[PDB]
Amino acid sequence: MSVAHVALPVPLPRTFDYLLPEKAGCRVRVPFGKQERIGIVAAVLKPVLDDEPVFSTTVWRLLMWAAEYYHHPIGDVLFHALPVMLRQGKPASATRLNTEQATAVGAIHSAADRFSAWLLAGITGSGKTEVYLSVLENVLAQGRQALVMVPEIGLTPQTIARFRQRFNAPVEVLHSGLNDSERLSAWLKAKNGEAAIVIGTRSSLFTPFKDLGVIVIDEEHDSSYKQQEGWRYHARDLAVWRAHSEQIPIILGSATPALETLHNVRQGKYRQLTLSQQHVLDLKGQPLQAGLSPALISRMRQHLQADNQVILFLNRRGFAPALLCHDCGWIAECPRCDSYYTLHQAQHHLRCHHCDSQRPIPRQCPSCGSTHLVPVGIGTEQLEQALAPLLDVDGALFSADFRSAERFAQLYTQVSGRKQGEVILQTHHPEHPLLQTLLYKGYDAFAEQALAERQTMQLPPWTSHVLIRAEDHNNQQAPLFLQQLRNLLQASPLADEKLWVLGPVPALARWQILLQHPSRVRLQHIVSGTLALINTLVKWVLDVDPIEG
Numbered sequence: 001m002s003v004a005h006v007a008l009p010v011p012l013p014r015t016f017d018y019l020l021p022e023k024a025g026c027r028v029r030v031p032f033g034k035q036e037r038i039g040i041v042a043a044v045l046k047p048v049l050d051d052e053p054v055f056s057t058t059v060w061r062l063l064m065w066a067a068e069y070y071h072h073p074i075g076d077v078l079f080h081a082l083p084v085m086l087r088q089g090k091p092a093s094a095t096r097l098n099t100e101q102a103t104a105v106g107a108i109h110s111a112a113d114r115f116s117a118w119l120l121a122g123i124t125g126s127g128k129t130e131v132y133l134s135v136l137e138n139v140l141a142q143g144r145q146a147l148v149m150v151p152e153i154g155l156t157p158q159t160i161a162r163f164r165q166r167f168n169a170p171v172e173v174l175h176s177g178l179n180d181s182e183r184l185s186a187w188l189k190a191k192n193g194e195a196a197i198v199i200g201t202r203s204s205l206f207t208p209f210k211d212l213g214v215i216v217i218d219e220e221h222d223s224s225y226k227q228q229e230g231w232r233y234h235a236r237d238l239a240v241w242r243a244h245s246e247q248i249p250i251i252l253g254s255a256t257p258a259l260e261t262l263h264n265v266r267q268g269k270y271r272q273l274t275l276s277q278q279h280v281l282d283l284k285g286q287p288l289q290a291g292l293s294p295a296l297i298s299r300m301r302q303h304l305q306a307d308n309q310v311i312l313f314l315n316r317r318g319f320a321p322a323l324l325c326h327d328c329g330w331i332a333e334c335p336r337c338d339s340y341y342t343l344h345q346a347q348h349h350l351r352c353h354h355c356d357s358q359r360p361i362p363r364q365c366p367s368c369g370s371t372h373l374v375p376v377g378i379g380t381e382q383l384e385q386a387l388a389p390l391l392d393v394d395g396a397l398f399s400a401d402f403r404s405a406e407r408f409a410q411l412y413t414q415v416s417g418r419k420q421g422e423v424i425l426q427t428h429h430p431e432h433p434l435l436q437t438l439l440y441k442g443y444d445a446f447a448e449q450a451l452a453e454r455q456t457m458q459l460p461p462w463t464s465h466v467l468i469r470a471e472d473h474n475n476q477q478a479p480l481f482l483q484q485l486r487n488l489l490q491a492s493p494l495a496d497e498k499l500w501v502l503g504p505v506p507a508l509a510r511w512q513i514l515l516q517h518p519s520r521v522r523l524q525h526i527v528s529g530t531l532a533l534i535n536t537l538v539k540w541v542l543d544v545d546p547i548e549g
C-alpha cells in the first residue's frame with residue numbers, strides 16, 4: 001500500500017490524499033473536483049512534475065516549522081515560497097578595514113563553520129557594509145554562497161553596482177522589477193551554485209542554495225521584513241531559524257537595533273559586535289499654529305530665507321490618538337490599569353486598550369481646569385492645509401501602541417545624523433525620563449531602559465504575543481465570534497493563569513483579540529489545539545509575533 005499526502009494552494013490547514021500507480025517535496029498534477037490542479041507532495045482516492053524535490057532539505061524543514069509556528073495552511077505556505085512559474089506547474093529549467101572592523105570580520109570568521117547569530121551594531125555609515133563585504137569575501141573564497149537581505153526600498157542601483165564591482169563572481173539580484181522568467185532563472189542559478197551571492201528583499205529568504213555559507217540582513221529593524229498580508233511571517237526570525245538548521249553564521253546589521261534583537265543579545269541568543277545641535281521646545285501654554293510653536297516657525301523661516309529645505313516628521317496615519325491638557329500637561333490615564341486612554345471623539349467617549357474601560361470625554365481638564373484639552377498624534381489632517389498659508393513627540397510617548405517609543409527612538413537616532421544641521425523637538429513633556437535618556441545618553445541607553453520597562457509591563461520581547469483579526473460589515477456580532485474563540489481558548493489545557501487574553505477589543509482602526517504568555521512554545525501549542533477545532537466560522541486572520549502597526 002502507498003498513497004501520497006498532497007498539499008494544495010488553499011486556505012485550509014490540511015493535506016489531500018491521492019493514489020500512486022507503479023518523493024515528498026516534488027510537484028504533482030492532481031485532479032481536484034472536476035478541474036485539475038498543481039500540488040506538492042507533503043508525505044507518502046483518485047490517482048495523480050518533478051524528478052527531484054523542488055525545495056532543498058533545510059528549506060523544506062524551515063517551511064514545515066514556519067507553517068505550524070504562524071498557524072498558516074501548509075498549502076499556501078509552500079506555494080507562497082515558490083517562483084510563480086513553479087506554482088503553475090512548469091518545468092524546473094531555463095534555456096580598507098580598521099581595527100574594530102577587522103576584529104568583527106575575524107570573530108565571525110572564527111565561528112563560520114557552524115551557527116552563530118551576530119548583531120553588527122554601528123552608527124550610520126561607520127561601514128557596517130564594509131564588514132559584510134569582507135565576511136562575504138572569506139565565505140566566497142571557500143566556494144560557499146551567500147544571501148543578502150535588504151529592506152524593500154534598499155535595492156538602489158548604487159548599492160547593487162558597489163557589490164558587483166567588489167566581487168569577481170556572479171551576483172544575482174532579485175529586485176521587484178524582474179518578470180517571472182527572470183525570477184525563475186535566478187532561482188535556478190542559486191540552486192545550482194552558479195550564483196555566488198543572492199541579494200533580495202523579504203521573499204529572497206526562501207531561495208534555495210547548493211551550499212549557503214552566510215546570511216546578511218541589513219537594517220535588521222526595518223518593517224518590510226514582516227509580511228502584512230496573507231501569510232504573516234517575519235523574514236528576520238526565519239532567516240535566523242534557517243541559519244540555525246543549516247549551521248551557518250547570520251549577520252544582523254542595524255544602527256538602531258530592534259529591542260527584540262538587543263534582548264537576544266543580553267541573553268545568550270546573539271552576540272554583539274560593535275563599531276564607533278538640538279532644541280527641545282515646551283509646547284505647554286503656547287499658541288500653536290498647525291501644532292507648530294512660534295519658536296519653531298521663527299527658526300523655520302530663517303532656514304527658508306537662506307534657501308534651504310526643511311523636513312517635518314509625524315506619526316504615520318489612522319492611529320487613534322491620546323488626550324492631554326495643552327496648558328498643564330495632564331494626560332488621560334485609565335485609573336484601573338496605568339495606561340493611556342485612547343480618544344474616540346467620533347463615538348464621543350474615551351477608551352482604554354490595555355483593559356476595556358469607557359469614560360466620557362471631559363470638556364475641561366480635571367487637574368487645572370483648562371478648556372484647552374487637545375488630541376495628540378495627528379498629521380494625516382493635511383498639515384499642508386495649515387502650512388500653505390504659513391513634531392508630535394507626544395504621539396510617540398503617549399500612544400496606545402507600546403512600540404511607539406521604540407519607533408521614535410529609531411527615527412530620531414537616524415535623523416540625528418542626516419554643514420551644521422539643526423534638530424528641533426516639540427513636546428508637552430520635555431523632561432520625560434525615557435526621552436531624556438535618548439537625547440543625552442543615546443539609543444543603546446534608551447533601549448536598555450525601555451527594555452527593563454517592557455519586563456515590568458510583561459510586554460514583548462519579554463513575552464510572546466499573538467493577534468487574531470476579524471472584519472465584519474455588521475460592526476457588531478463579529479466580536480461575538482472572537483468571544484466564542486476566547487472561551488474556547490480558556491479551557492484548552494494550558495491556562496497556567498499566565499496565559500493572558502485581551503477580550504474582543506476594537507482595532508486601532510475591525511476587531512481583534514490579543515494573547516500573551518512568557519513561553520513562546522506554550523503559546524504556539526495553545527493556539528495549535530484551540531484552532532484544531534472551530535465552527536461557523538467572517539474574515540479572520542492569525543498574526544504571530546505581530547508588529548501591530
Ligand SMILES: [Zn+2]
Nearest residue numbers: 334337352355
Ligand atoms: Zn485600563
Ligand SMILES: [Zn+2]
Nearest residue numbers: 325328365368
Ligand atoms: Zn490641565
